Design an enzyme around this catalytic site. Structure first.
Site, PDB file in Angstrom:
ATOM      1  N   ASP A  30       0.819  -1.163   0.000  1.00  0.00           N
ATOM      2  CA  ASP A  30       0.000   0.000   0.000  1.00  0.00           C
ATOM      3  C   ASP A  30       0.881   1.251   0.000  1.00  0.00           C
ATOM      4  O   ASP A  30       0.614   2.218  -0.709  1.00  0.00           O
ATOM      5  CB  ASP A  30      -0.968  -0.058   1.215  1.00  0.00           C
ATOM      6  CG  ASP A  30      -1.926   1.121   1.301  1.00  0.00           C
ATOM      7  OD1 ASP A  30      -1.540   2.255   1.697  1.00  0.00           O
ATOM      8  OD2 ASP A  30      -3.087   0.912   0.983  1.00  0.00           O
ATOM      9  N   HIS A  31       1.967   1.193   0.783  1.00  0.00           N
ATOM     10  CA  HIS A  31       2.926   2.265   0.912  1.00  0.00           C
ATOM     11  C   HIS A  31       3.802   2.542  -0.311  1.00  0.00           C
ATOM     12  O   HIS A  31       4.492   3.556  -0.367  1.00  0.00           O
ATOM     13  CB  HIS A  31       3.746   2.035   2.211  1.00  0.00           C
ATOM     14  CG  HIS A  31       2.905   2.143   3.431  1.00  0.00           C
ATOM     15  ND1 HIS A  31       3.415   2.215   4.706  1.00  0.00           N
ATOM     16  CD2 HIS A  31       1.555   2.251   3.559  1.00  0.00           C
ATOM     17  CE1 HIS A  31       2.427   2.337   5.575  1.00  0.00           C
ATOM     18  NE2 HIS A  31       1.282   2.373   4.901  1.00  0.00           N
ATOM     19  N   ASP A  32       3.739   1.648  -1.295  1.00  0.00           N
ATOM     20  CA  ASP A  32       4.427   1.807  -2.574  1.00  0.00           C
ATOM     21  C   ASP A  32       3.436   2.458  -3.541  1.00  0.00           C
ATOM     22  O   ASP A  32       3.826   3.149  -4.484  1.00  0.00           O
ATOM     23  CB  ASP A  32       4.860   0.437  -3.029  1.00  0.00           C
ATOM     24  CG  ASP A  32       5.775   0.424  -4.273  1.00  0.00           C
ATOM     25  OD1 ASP A  32       5.963   1.457  -4.963  1.00  0.00           O
ATOM     26  OD2 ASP A  32       6.305  -0.683  -4.551  1.00  0.00           O
TER      27      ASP A  32
HETATM   28  C1  HEM Z   1      -0.276  -2.017  11.785  1.00  0.00           C
HETATM   29  C2  HEM Z   1      -1.357  -2.039  10.787  1.00  0.00           C
HETATM   30  C3  HEM Z   1      -1.948  -0.793  10.310  1.00  0.00           C
HETATM   31  C4  HEM Z   1      -2.124   0.438  10.926  1.00  0.00           C
HETATM   32  C5  HEM Z   1      -1.799   0.858  12.358  1.00  0.00           C
HETATM   33  C6  HEM Z   1      -2.810   1.201   9.848  1.00  0.00           C
HETATM   34  C7  HEM Z   1      -3.279   2.588  10.043  1.00  0.00           C
HETATM   35  C8  HEM Z   1      -3.897   3.422   8.995  1.00  0.00           C
HETATM   36  C9  HEM Z   1      -4.308   4.720   9.211  1.00  0.00           C
HETATM   37  C10 HEM Z   1      -4.249   5.526  10.499  1.00  0.00           C
HETATM   38  C11 HEM Z   1      -4.815   5.141   8.011  1.00  0.00           C
HETATM   39  C12 HEM Z   1      -5.399   6.485   7.692  1.00  0.00           C
HETATM   40  C13 HEM Z   1      -6.771   6.563   8.328  1.00  0.00           C
HETATM   41  C14 HEM Z   1      -7.528   7.786   7.811  1.00  0.00           C
HETATM   42  O1  HEM Z   1      -7.347   8.856   8.443  1.00  0.00           O
HETATM   43  O2  HEM Z   1      -8.290   7.728   6.804  1.00  0.00           O
HETATM   44  C15 HEM Z   1      -4.639   4.067   7.191  1.00  0.00           C
HETATM   45  C16 HEM Z   1      -4.950   4.110   5.812  1.00  0.00           C
HETATM   46  C17 HEM Z   1      -4.652   3.092   4.825  1.00  0.00           C
HETATM   47  N1  HEM Z   1      -4.311   1.828   5.057  1.00  0.00           N
HETATM   48 FE1  HEM Z   1      -3.932   1.053   6.946  1.00  0.00          FE
HETATM   49  N2  HEM Z   1      -2.884   0.524   8.704  1.00  0.00           N
HETATM   50  C18 HEM Z   1      -2.491  -0.695   8.970  1.00  0.00           C
HETATM   51  C19 HEM Z   1      -2.457  -1.824   8.104  1.00  0.00           C
HETATM   52  C20 HEM Z   1      -2.906  -1.841   6.714  1.00  0.00           C
HETATM   53  C21 HEM Z   1      -2.922  -3.078   5.919  1.00  0.00           C
HETATM   54  C22 HEM Z   1      -2.435  -4.422   6.347  1.00  0.00           C
HETATM   55  C23 HEM Z   1      -3.384  -2.625   4.692  1.00  0.00           C
HETATM   56  C24 HEM Z   1      -3.573  -3.328   3.383  1.00  0.00           C
HETATM   57  C25 HEM Z   1      -3.701  -4.778   3.146  1.00  0.00           C
HETATM   58  C26 HEM Z   1      -3.664  -1.193   4.828  1.00  0.00           C
HETATM   59  C27 HEM Z   1      -4.105  -0.279   3.794  1.00  0.00           C
HETATM   60  C28 HEM Z   1      -4.320   1.172   3.922  1.00  0.00           C
HETATM   61  C29 HEM Z   1      -4.534   2.134   2.789  1.00  0.00           C
HETATM   62  C30 HEM Z   1      -4.515   1.918   1.302  1.00  0.00           C
HETATM   63  C31 HEM Z   1      -4.713   3.378   3.385  1.00  0.00           C
HETATM   64  C32 HEM Z   1      -4.897   4.715   2.749  1.00  0.00           C
HETATM   65  C33 HEM Z   1      -3.481   5.231   2.448  1.00  0.00           C
HETATM   66  C34 HEM Z   1      -3.404   6.642   1.848  1.00  0.00           C
HETATM   67  O3  HEM Z   1      -3.754   6.814   0.634  1.00  0.00           O
HETATM   68  O4  HEM Z   1      -2.950   7.597   2.543  1.00  0.00           O
HETATM   69  N3  HEM Z   1      -3.481  -0.796   6.094  1.00  0.00           N
HETATM   70  N4  HEM Z   1      -4.286   2.956   7.797  1.00  0.00           N
HETATM   71  O1  LIG Z   2       0.144   3.088   8.243  1.00  0.00           O
HETATM   72  C1  LIG Z   2      -0.710   3.627   7.557  1.00  0.00           C
HETATM   73  N1  LIG Z   2      -1.248   3.015   6.491  1.00  0.00           N
HETATM   74  O2  LIG Z   2      -0.851   1.702   6.180  1.00  0.00           O
HETATM   75  C2  LIG Z   2      -1.105   4.996   7.846  1.00  0.00           C
HETATM   76  C3  LIG Z   2      -0.872   5.562   9.099  1.00  0.00           C
HETATM   77  N2  LIG Z   2      -1.204   6.816   9.316  1.00  0.00           N
HETATM   78  C4  LIG Z   2      -1.757   7.546   8.373  1.00  0.00           C
HETATM   79  N3  LIG Z   2      -2.061   8.852   8.626  1.00  0.00           N
HETATM   80  C5  LIG Z   2      -2.137   9.332  10.003  1.00  0.00           C
HETATM   81  C6  LIG Z   2      -0.752   9.635  10.503  1.00  0.00           C
HETATM   82  C7  LIG Z   2       0.346   9.559   9.674  1.00  0.00           C
HETATM   83  C8  LIG Z   2       1.618   9.852  10.163  1.00  0.00           C
HETATM   84  C9  LIG Z   2       2.785   9.739   9.209  1.00  0.00           C
HETATM   85  F1  LIG Z   2       2.342   9.817   7.887  1.00  0.00           F
HETATM   86  F2  LIG Z   2       3.758  10.716   9.396  1.00  0.00           F
HETATM   87  F3  LIG Z   2       3.351   8.515   9.450  1.00  0.00           F
HETATM   88  C10 LIG Z   2       1.793  10.233  11.486  1.00  0.00           C
HETATM   89  C11 LIG Z   2       0.669  10.319  12.301  1.00  0.00           C
HETATM   90  C12 LIG Z   2       0.753  10.699  13.758  1.00  0.00           C
HETATM   91  F4  LIG Z   2       0.004  11.862  13.959  1.00  0.00           F
HETATM   92  F5  LIG Z   2       0.232   9.645  14.523  1.00  0.00           F
HETATM   93  F6  LIG Z   2       2.074  10.899  14.138  1.00  0.00           F
HETATM   94  C13 LIG Z   2      -0.586  10.012  11.816  1.00  0.00           C
HETATM   95  N4  LIG Z   2      -2.020   7.049   7.140  1.00  0.00           N
HETATM   96  C14 LIG Z   2      -1.697   5.779   6.828  1.00  0.00           C
HETATM   97  O3  LIG Z   2      -1.907   5.322   5.711  1.00  0.00           O
HETATM   98 CA   LIG Z   3       5.195   3.463  -6.133  1.00  0.00          CA
END
Ligand code: HEM
Ligand SMILES: O=C(NO)c1cnc(NCc2cc(C(F)(F)F)cc(C(F)(F)F)c2)[nH]c1=O
Ligand SMILES: [Ca+2]
Ligand SMILES: *[C@@H]1O[C@H](CO[C@@H]2O[C@@H](C)[C@@H](O)[C@@H](O)[C@@H]2O)[C@@H](O[C@@H]2O[C@H](CO)[C@@H](O[C@@H]3O[C@H](CO[C@H]4O[C@H](CO)[C@@H](O)[C@H](O)[C@@H]4O)[C@@H](O[C@H]4O[C@H](CO)[C@@H](O)[C@H](O)[C@@H]4O)[C@H](O)[C@@H]3O)[C@H](O)[C@H]2NC(C)=O)[C@H](O)[C@H]1NC(C)=O
Ligand SMILES: *[C@@H]1O[C@H](CO)[C@@H](O)[C@H](O)[C@H]1NC(C)=O
Ligand SMILES: *[C@@H]1O[C@H](CO)[C@@H](O)[C@H](O)[C@H]1NC(C)=O
Ligand SMILES: [Cl-]
Lengths: 104, 466
Positions: free
Chosen positions: A94-96
């Site tokens: 997802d991060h890529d």
């Molecule tokens: C330790 C596990 C994880 C944590 C703590 C986590 C946390 C987050 C957070 C905080 C967001 C943004 C929430 C928002 O404000 O809308 C996020 C978005 C997202 N996550 Fe997760 N995540 C986790 C695992 C995963 C996994 C395993 C997948 C995929 C199989 C995934 C896919 C995504 C995607 C695509 C986004 C939106 C990214 C963007 O465009 O910025 N996440 N998640």
């Molecule tokens: O791991 C994630 N996805 O797989 C994920 C985590 N956090 C955010 N956004 C919230 C966020 C991001 C960051 C970031 F982008 F710098 F890591 C730092 C914070 C905070 F405030 F907790 F320090 C919150 N978005 C994401 O997609």
């Molecule tokens: Ca990429």
């Protein structure tokens, strides 16, 4: 774009030579369906009290989470056919692919 | 209006309102903080609000290398002509490289343990420190770059710094593409949806739009259903590593200090390999470690990740469930009974109907993860269509796809076909026993495990120019 290149650019620019920002960084997402906003162009559903979506009240995200998502952790089912590495590769991948900026 | 401290609804904030009788937050004057995603055109009264992708949509290891020029050069070791990524200058993991430290202004990783004073890590993507399991994956790929660059400098003495970095970057990217499309995706989608959405690669088509669709940033969050409520660390016999074998997730978020001062990446990678994923069940969607206590250490209130998902979809103006079903060519239930058949679960269809009124209004992540999983897959028909379509686009529309003619030689493609995540773990850690392929299915030690000597190393012979 150059005529020849052995390696990707860092931004992703020039991968598509006809439309060179496609897949490049810091560009709008493509929309596969038109957006649905409460005012039609910017305000999200749930923004304005009493404004319904398709003739029904908008449900608080936290309430849907409380009612459908919440479960006692003691019921957790381990997946016999998947490792946690399957969860972690998804996140990594997802991060890529995407990061949607927000203001600081 | 500071979204993190205030509950006022003014731009750029869209706080999540709290219903009565919430099981955690008893004051309804409180909120879960939420910042609206940056608009692609701010203040416009012409454009329909759209959001930005700060990264390259391509499966090109941009989480390792970065998506913007200044970051990308700052991630490189410019002190020699060895083509390396920069490594931590203050710490090493039993003599093996860690990521460099970042210099942020309000570093959340410091807040997770005030005593350790370990800041967040600097990688190609800003979220590398979010959980130590993720940090471990980032650190692994940093090491693989550095290893491949070293061998390339021995195989080709005439190659300078720029050549070494780029050739090593190209290989790493292909490895991400191989593991993703060969090992990961068939297990996400199942065979019936793999065949339907990802048929055998033909070649590069410059008319296939490779952009991430707005819906994908939400659908792919299906992964949140796979999350276990602990981080699991295991020693060299794969047995629990004491005194803290299972740390609760709410104390690992941005806990970069745990990699640095609690055992390195080896114990974290072993735990990923030898602990099962959480299975998504219709009455067991997502754990309270992320539903109740997300980022609890680094801010004033614990977040609710599934709720944030639904709020984000509204923020992004994403259509609802039935509209996406229709996109995907799937029937669109209108009544609770039809929703019951489609879910094969009337009890859940009733909950969804009481919340949403109509299946038209079900938020896409919620609808998506509610669907029964495909045979041998880990998503329902809707998600499998969305994820599938995105991945086929990313492959068919990428001119640097590893199989595309001229990207690699015929001999290079044959060698890359031998790579694996287990073998990369072997080559870049102190881990000598790893998972049998497929690493994403294997979860039980010793039964699903093998010695690193049994796995062939990538042959870099075809990169020699001579
Ligand atoms: C330790 C596990 C994880 C944590 C703590 C986590 C946390 C987050 C957070 C905080 C967001 C943004 C929430 C928002 O404000 O809308 C996020 C978005 C997202 N996550 Fe997760 N995540 C986790 C695992 C995963 C996994 C395993 C997948 C995929 C199989 C995934 C896919 C995504 C995607 C695509 C986004 C939106 C990214 C963007 O465009 O910025 N996440 N998640
Ligand atoms: O791991 C994630 N996805 O797989 C994920 C985590 N956090 C955010 N956004 C919230 C966020 C991001 C960051 C970031 F982008 F710098 F890591 C730092 C914070 C905070 F405030 F907790 F320090 C919150 N978005 C994401 O997609
Ligand atoms: Ca990429
Ligand atoms: C290189 O890729 C191109 C893109 O391929 C798509 O994406 C891939 C990921 C993969 O999923 C493919 O299956 C996808 O198609 C591809 O070019 C596409 O080719 C198709 C088929 O020719 C085109 O589809 C046609 O479009 C017309 C026009 O209407 C379309 O657009 C409007 C407005 O958006 C919509 O309202 C419509 O619904 C359509 O989406 C259609 O007209 C008629 O065609 C038929 C008979 O002549 C008949 O069956 C129909 O009933 C209809 O009367 C047509 O049906 C079809 O939908 C598509 O638009 C092309 N895309 C682009 C970007 O050009 C290339 O062919 C591919 N090249 C190779 C060699 O593989
Ligand atoms: C650059 O490479 C040399 C050689 O491996 C190493 O000793 C040094 O620490 C590196 N510098 C950085 C910033 O990575
Ligand atoms: C913080 O890190 C120190 C080492 O600096 C460690 O001994 C201590 O346990 C950590 N805090 C917690 C709550 O674990
Ligand atoms: Cl979309």
């Amino acid at each position: 774009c150059p005529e020849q290149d052995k390696y990707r650019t860092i931004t992703g620019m020039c991968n598509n030579r006809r439309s060179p920002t496609l897949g490049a960084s810091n560009r709008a997402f493509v929309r596969w369906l038109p957006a649905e906003y409460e005012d039609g162009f910017s305000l999200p559903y749930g923004w304005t009290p009493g404004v319904k979506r398709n003739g029904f009240p908008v449900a608080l995200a936290r309430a849907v989470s409380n009612e459908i998502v919440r479960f006692p952790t003691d019921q957790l089912t381990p997946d016999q056919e998947r490792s946690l590495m399957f969860m972690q590769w998804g996140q990594l991948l997802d991060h890529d692919l995407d990061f949607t900026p927000e203001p600081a | 209006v500071n979204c993190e401290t205030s509950c006022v609804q003014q731009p750029p904030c869209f706080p999540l309102k709290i219903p009565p009788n919430d099981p955690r937050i008893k004051n309804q004057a409180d909120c879960i903080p939420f910042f609206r995603s940056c608009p692609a055109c701010p203040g416009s009264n012409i454009t329909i609000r759209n959001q930005i992708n700060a990264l390259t949509s391509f499966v090109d290891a941009s989480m390792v290398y970065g998506s913007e020029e200044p970051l990308a050069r700052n991630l490189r070791n410019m002190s020699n002509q060895l083509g390396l990524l920069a490594v931590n200058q203050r710490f090493q993991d039993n003599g093996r490289a860690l990521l460099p430290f970042d210099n942020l202004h309000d570093d959340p990783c410091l807040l997770t343990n005030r005593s350790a004073r370990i800041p967040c890590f600097l990688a190609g993507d800003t979220r590398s420190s979010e959980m130590p399991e993720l940090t471990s994956m980032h650190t692994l790929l940093l090491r693989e770059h550095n290893r491949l660059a070293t061998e390339l400098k021995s195989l080709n003495p005439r190659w300078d710094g720029e050549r070494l970095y780029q050739e090593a970057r190209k290989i790493v990217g292909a490895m991400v593409q191989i593991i993703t499309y060969r090992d990961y995706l068939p297990l996400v989608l199942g065979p019936t949806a793999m065949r339907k959405y990802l048929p055998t690669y033909r070649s590069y088509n410059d008319s296939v739009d490779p952009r991430i669709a707005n819906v994908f940033t939400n659908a792919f969050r299906y992964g949140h259903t796979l999350i276990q409520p602990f981080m699991f660390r295991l020693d060299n016999r794969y047995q629990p590593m004491e005194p803290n074998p299972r740390v609760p997730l709410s104390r690992v978020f941005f806990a970069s200090w745990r990699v640095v001062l609690e055992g390195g990446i080896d114990p974290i990678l072993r735990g990923l390999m030898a602990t099962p994923a959480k299975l998504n069940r219709q009455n067991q969607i997502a754990v309270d470690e992320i539903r109740e206590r997300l980022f609890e250490q680094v801010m004033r209130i614990g977040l609710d990740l599934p709720a944030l998902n639904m709020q984000r979809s509204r923020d992004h103006g994403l259509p609802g469930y039935n509209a996406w079903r229709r996109f995907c060519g799937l029937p669109q239930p209108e009544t609770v009974g039809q929703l019951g058949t489609v879910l094969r679960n009337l009890k859940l269809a009733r909950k969804l109907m009481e919340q949403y009124g109509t299946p038209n209004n079900i938020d896409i992540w919620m609808g998506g993860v509610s669907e029964p999983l495909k045979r041998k897959g880990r998503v329902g028909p809707l998600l499998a269509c969305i994820i599938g379509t995105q991945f086929r686009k990313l492959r068919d529309g990428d001119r640097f796809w590893w199989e595309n003619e001229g990207v690699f030689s015929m001999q290079q493609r044959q060698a890359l076909a031998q790579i694996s995540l287990p073998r990369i773990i072997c080559d870049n850690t102190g881990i000598t026993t790893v998972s049998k392929n497929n690493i994403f299915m294997s979860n039980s030690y010793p039964r699903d495990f093998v010695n690193c000597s049994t796995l062939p190393a990538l042959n870099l012979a075809s990169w020699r120019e001579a």
